[PDB]
Design a protein that fits this description.
3 copies of one chain form a homotrimer. In chain A, strands 3-2-1-4-5 form a 5-stranded parallel β-sheet, sandwiched between helices. Chain A has helices spanning 14-24, 46-55, 72-78, 91-107, 127-135, 146-155, and strands at residues 2-7, 29-35, 63-68, 83-87, 112-116. Chain A is built from 6 helices and 5 strands; from the N terminus they run E-H-E-H-E-H-E-H-E-H-H. The first copy, chain A, has a single domain, classed as HUPs (Rossmann fold). Chain A has 157 residues and is α/β, with parallel strands linked by helices. Chain A starts with a strand and ends with a helix. Helices cover 41% and strands 18% of the residues of chain A. The interface between A and C is medium-sized, with 17 and 15 residues. The complex binds phosphoaminophosphonic acid-adenylate ester (3 copies). One phosphoaminophosphonic acid-adenylate ester binds next to helix 1, strand 4 and helix 5 of chain C.
């Protein structure tokens, strides 16, 4: 089993990292697929986001980070993954993932879509929230890895 | 009864199409009112979206297609329609249509708001999803009419 | 003893906002309307204008003040020494976003409470986004907004 965890990860947070720790324990191979997502004007470049996700995850031997800008249903076949991993924090996540799962079932029928929910300690962590707090000088050290905090710190001065 | 089905239809999809076939069977006159929707930066122009919706409903005699860029509560009067038709796919749709209907009740008190839910076969189909998949060269033929599929294909080349 | 801070974008302030302000003024000693600059929303009215509009609609309430701000809300509520946030819940969407924002503020401002009101069903559907879109198309929005705000929309789209 090779699982693919796709997202924008702008930047990667302790919310993502918890899911990755749990996936790392359940599957033989975990690939973090950082989506380019140019139409979201991500705060960080694809290169940095890949780099932060690597730094935050280097300590896990069966976890890899890779960037992509193609259709997710195509990229998963290029990585030879048979499982999608997504996280569910709230009903808006569930609805969207529910629809995307039915959709990817059409585009990539041999790929399962599976979901995890967060630990209550990380259920509320948003990348949009971390970005908006850091841009106004709020402390985001409780929601991200130190390297990411350091990155946010540098990015806004 | 003259029912008015307003939407952005960017582009019209098999989910829209299912609701229209079912409405045409239920009401004497069905108008598809295509909204300009400038705040949505539509992939297609209002003219193309009208042409597409008309092409897809060509075979239904009690169905007409019209473009409009005015307030919906004014346009429905200009069309002398007494019923709104809207679709409900998910809690997100339900919330929004619920708010829009109490709002249209103030602006157009003589117009009913009514809802259909999609066949499970088209429940997951989103216009936004169709657009984002076509933009990355994923096959979207199962979610749209052949003319619409061609129109997406041409739109990114 | 209780100083409550109601933060929002207020673009523009609405009768839905107004009901909550009315109900809160009856409930707390001091009510502060904190209007966020919200540049990331490309607001229709300027901060200066939104503040002024929010003031005109609230002048009849003595324990209510209006102030604009563009700093972090969790810093700003401390700066106002307010001990409770007021937010409104109209629908599941508000509830999710507010639930997530309250847990986040609990981390940034642990001694500030987050509390919620739900709208009277007569203002349940009123949105600033809705009022703006209707006015921009010349609809009558007088039932959703105070006369000063209605006038402000009409002129802004002319
Ligand atoms: N704190 C979290 N806990 C559990 N799952 C999460 C969490 N944050 C993000 N995710 C999930 O993991 C995936 C990747 O997240 P990501 O794409 O970076 O965020 P996003 O959906 O674009 N929105 P945002 O986090 O608000 O910027 C999403 O499917 C999310 O459902
Ligand atoms: N597959 C579908 N089945 C039933 N109703 C739908 C479907 N797709 C869209 N609608 C409904 O038909 C109406 C017009 O939709 P429309 O404005 O074109 O899409 P939208 O509002 O942009 N949503 P989205 O599909 O996320 O792009 C709305 O009432 C919708 O909820
Ligand atoms: N009619 C209303 N009734 C009760 N609370 C409301 C109402 N409208 C807005 N609010 C709440 O008051 C707060 C401030 O709102 P604000 O951000 O300025 O508008 P908004 O939430 O962006 N509305 P909209 O832009 O139309 O989606 C939020 O917690 C809102 O959910």
């Amino acid at each position: 089993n090779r699982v693919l965890y796709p997202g924008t990860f702008d930047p990667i947070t302790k919310g993502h990292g918890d899911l990755i720790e749990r996936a790392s324990r359940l599957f033989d191979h975990v690939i973090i697929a950082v989506a380019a997502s140019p139409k979201k004007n991500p705060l960080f470049s694809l290169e940095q986001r890949v780099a932060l996700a690597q730094e935050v995850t280097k300590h896990l031997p069966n976890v890899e980070v890779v960037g992509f800008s193609t259709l997710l249903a195509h990229f998963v076949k290029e990585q030879k993954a048979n499982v999608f991993l997504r996280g569910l924090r709230a009903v808006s996540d569930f609805e969207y993932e529910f629809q995307l799962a039915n959709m990817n079932r059409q585009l990539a029928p041999d790929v399962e879509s599976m979901f995890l929910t967060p630990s209550e300690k990380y259920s509320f962590i948003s990348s949009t929230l971390v970005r908006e707090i850091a841009a106004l000088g709020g402390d985001i050290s409780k929601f991200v890895h130190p390297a990411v905090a350091d990155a946010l710190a540098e990015r806004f001065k």
